[PDB]
Amino acid sequence: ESQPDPKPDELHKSSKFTGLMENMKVLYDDNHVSAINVKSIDQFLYFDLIYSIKDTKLGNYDNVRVEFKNKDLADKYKDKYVDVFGANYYYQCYFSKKTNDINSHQTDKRKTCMYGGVTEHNGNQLDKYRSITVRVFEDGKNLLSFDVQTNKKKVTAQELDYLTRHYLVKNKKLYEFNNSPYETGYIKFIENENSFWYDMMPAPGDKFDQSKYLMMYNDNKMVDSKDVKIEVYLTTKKK
Ligand SMILES: OC[C@H]1O[C@@H](O[C@H]2[C@H](O)[C@@H](O)[C@H](O)O[C@@H]2CO)[C@H](O)[C@@H](O)[C@H]1O
């Protein structure tokens, strides 16, 4: 069980962020990118892939740019049929501008951007959703547990993360417009000796960089739905 647990002073303090929690909230509200059995259709930079995924409700986007940590990840998934799932942003998002020569590009009307959140479709399917347990702790006490479901054998940490936080925003007011009732918090995934966590709170300051925050998912970290367990540790802001 190692990826050093955070030392209490290591975590971002929500009281140190003085600039609109709504921008964090939106990433984990009901909207998100999801598609099954799609194939990249273009590329803007050598470390990304462009997908033809239409916003199936709000009609907010027609193309989604998936950015990876490096060229390898983009190469691996180029041309392959994948499922996509993840938190997207719009504000600092941009790519291609047109189907121009020299500058390899394409994409017309309504774009969105995201990091990682990709898995091979083929051979990664289960008929019969697997249920992953989430145990949340508030100041040290296991106050509740809820389930998250995925029908993927291999699932990105991004998806389990979004799933978990989406429930907490709805039932625990994890993030609110201008604040959060929690001072610190982190999501811990556990497979085996392998455990890793993400800080759920925004960095100190007056502004939150959605793009920079969502960047932690660019490694396309995957996990096996059969071996994972998730624990959330929240601490209450000095009442
Ligand atoms: O069993 C062969 C049969 O599968 C259908 O697909 C179904 C599948 O039967 C069911 O278990 C699953 O839950 O939903 C699928 C619907 O896509 C196919 O429609 C049929 O063409 C055969 O392929």
Side-chain angles (χ1 to χ4, degrees), residues 1-97 106-239:
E1 195 81 298
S2 198
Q3 190 253 268
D5 251 23
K7 131 136 281 302
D9 256 357
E10 181 171 341
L11 297 166
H12 292 151
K13 320 306 160 55
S14 67
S15 54
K16 259 57 243 295
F17 173 72
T18 61
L20 195 69
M21 193 65 81
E22 179 76 355
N23 286 314
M24 168 65 97
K25 202 279 269 287
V26 59
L27 302 173
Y28 302 98
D29 198 47
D30 302 292
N31 308 310
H32 65 111
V33 174
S34 193
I36 97 120
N37 201 48
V38 285
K39 181 192 157 291
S40 46
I41 50 147
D42 202 18
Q43 184 169 48
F44 172 49
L45 266 31
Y46 68 88
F47 46 87
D48 70 50
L49 289 174
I50 311 303
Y51 288 88
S52 17
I53 293 161
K54 72 310 215 298
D55 184 350
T56 354
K57 15 199 63 141
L58 274 307
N60 272 173
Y61 51 76
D62 287 289
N63 289 295
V64 181
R65 173 197 182 208
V66 178
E67 180 175 326
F68 296 97
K69 204 175 195 216
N70 60 39
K71 187 168 182 288
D72 288 295
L73 287 160
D75 286 350
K76 179 156 40 207
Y77 297 113
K78 172 88 271 186
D79 300 307
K80 287 189 175 75
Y81 275 104
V82 296
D83 300 321
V84 185
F85 191 102
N88 57 301
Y89 62 104
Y90 295 100
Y91 303 156
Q92 321 94 103
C93 170
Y94 170 75
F95 58 92
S96 286
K97 68 266 223 82
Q106 175 261 157
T107 305
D108 281 337
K109 192 172 180 175
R110 305 189 184 157
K111 322 162 176 302
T112 202
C113 289
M114 57 180 279
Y115 293 90
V118 168
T119 44
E120 267 185 69
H121 176 81
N122 32 293
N124 205 43
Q125 298 289 233
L126 281 160
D127 192 8
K128 283 167 57 174
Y129 269 66
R130 216 120 73 142
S131 273
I132 301 91
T133 307
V134 192
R135 283 155 42 88
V136 23
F137 296 74
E138 290 197 34
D139 298 298
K141 301 102 108 149
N142 182 17
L143 291 204
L144 74 142
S145 298
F146 56 108
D147 272 20
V148 128
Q149 295 91 349
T150 190
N151 62 357
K152 288 157 176 180
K153 303 205 285 196
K154 254 70 190 180
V155 62
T156 65
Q158 189 178 359
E159 174 169 355
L160 305 180
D161 195 6
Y162 165 85
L163 258 24
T164 287
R165 303 204 201 178
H166 175 75
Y167 182 102
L168 294 171
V169 306
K170 297 319 174 105
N171 308 283
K172 288 303 213 173
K173 304 157 283 290
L174 176 49
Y175 310 123
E176 304 195 279
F177 186 74
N178 46 3
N179 100 119
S180 165
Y182 300 101
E183 166 79 326
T184 66
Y186 65 98
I187 181 154
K188 178 167 180 173
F189 293 88
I190 302 150
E191 241 173 333
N192 263 265
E193 185 267 0
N194 306 91
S195 78
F196 59 98
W197 54 272
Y198 292 139
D199 188 330
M200 298 164 113
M201 291 300 158
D206 74 332
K207 237 297 110 295
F208 174 61
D209 200 343
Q210 290 182 329
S211 178
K212 244 53 195 169
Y213 185 80
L214 265 0
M215 201 189 283
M216 48 170 217
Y217 301 133
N218 72 10
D219 62 4
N220 209 51
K221 185 122 207 177
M222 273 167 248
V223 126
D224 193 327
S225 61
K226 75 170 183 64
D227 287 283
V228 244
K229 260 246 60 261
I230 311 155
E231 300 174 338
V232 174
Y233 292 91
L234 299 157
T235 270
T236 44
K237 282 211 264 201
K238 273 110 253 65
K239 176 174 169 58

